[PDB]
Amino acid sequence: MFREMPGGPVWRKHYITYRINNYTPDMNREDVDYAIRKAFQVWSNVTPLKFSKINTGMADILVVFARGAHGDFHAFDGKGGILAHAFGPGSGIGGDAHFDEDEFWTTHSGGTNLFLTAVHEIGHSLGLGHSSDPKAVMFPTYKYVDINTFRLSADDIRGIQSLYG
Ligand SMILES: CC(C)[C@H](NS(=O)(=O)c1ccc2c(c1)sc1ccccc12)C(=O)O
Ligand SMILES: [Zn+2]
Ligand SMILES: [Zn+2]
């Protein structure tokens, strides 16, 4: 009762497209796109895939930020608890996930880093289950650092390598 698995854009588990039809009026909107472009790269760097964003149309997964609530989902509980969410990516209005802005963000980091989190969120995208504790970017602030200082560990590399490149 869920075998359904369609896809409009280049969907083949190999290439995943991401589109941001919205951001949030509080910080450089470009800093939200740039880091997302540098984030999807972290994966291509260690994978022979190709993730690209279309200027307009339908993308494998739609990203949208908001605060308080946004119709979809049972609405965020507020600041705390969860920091992000991700629904089964593959169904029509399913991949079009949304990020919880109910918290205080800052491109300068400090609070909740969206960059480090970026690579984490994508982890679920590639149906990547969770590990035990291999100091993976999953761990809370495994390596809290700027976006240009972002670096993976040999342990986090032992998880993805499971694909053999
Ligand atoms: C959605 C939720 C159940 C869970 N994610 S989480 O617990 O919200 C979760 C897990 C990892 C990280 C954050 C939030 S915030 C952050 C900053 C830097 C690096 C890592 C992370 C999940 O992995 O599915
Ligand atoms: Zn949402
Ligand atoms: Zn995770």
Q: How many CB atoms lie within 10 A of CB 122?
A: 21
Dist. CA 132 → ligand 1 center (Å): 14
Which CATH number does the domain housing residue 146 bear?
3.40.390.10
Number of independent structural domains in the chain: 1
Residue 113 beta carbon below 6 angstroms from any ligand 1 atom? yes
Show me where the chain is broken: residue before each gap, C-N > 2.5 A: none
What residues form DSSP beta bridges with 100?
Answer: 66
Q: How far is residue 62 CA from its own chain's centroid? A: 10
What residues form DSSP beta bridges with 70?
Answer: 72
Long-range contacts of 158-161 (CB under 8 A, 24+ apart): 158/134, 159/128, 159/131, 159/134, 160/46, 160/47, 160/128, 161/46
- Which residues lie closer than 8 Å to 132 by C-beta, 6 or more apart? none
CB 62 within 8 A of CB 97: yes
Catalytic hit among 121, 123, 136, 156: 121
What's the CA gap between 3 and 84, in Å, rounded?
26
How was this structure determined? It was done by: NMR
| Annotation marks residue 121 as catalytic | yes
Q: Which of 76, 83, 139 to mutate to test the pocket of ligand 1 (most atoms within 8 A of CB)?
A: 83
Tell me the residue ranges of DSSP E strands in 4-69: 18-20, 61-66
- Which residues lie closer than 8 Å to 123 by C-beta, 6 or more apart? 137, 138
What's the CA gap between 108 and 84, in Å, rounded?
19
List CB-based neighbours of ion ligand 3 within 5 Å: 138
Q: How far is residue 17 CA from its own chain's centroid? A: 12
- Which residues lie closer than 8 Å to 10 by C-beta, 6 or more apart? 17, 60
DSSP 66-118: ESS-BSBTT----SSS-SB----BTBHHHH--EEE-SS---TT-SS--HHHHH
What residues form DSSP beta bridges with 72?
Answer: 70
Q: Which domain holds residue 120?
A: 1-165
Dist. CA 129 → ligand 3 center (Å): 7
CB 23 within 8 A of CB 17: no
In this structure, the residue with its CA closest to atom 16 of ligand 1 is 117
For residue 116, with 0-12 CB atoms within 10 Å meaning exposed, 13-18 middle and 19 or more buried, which class applies?
buried
List CB-based neighbours of ion ligand 2 within 5 Å: 72-73, 98
Q: What's the DSSP call for residue 67?
A: S
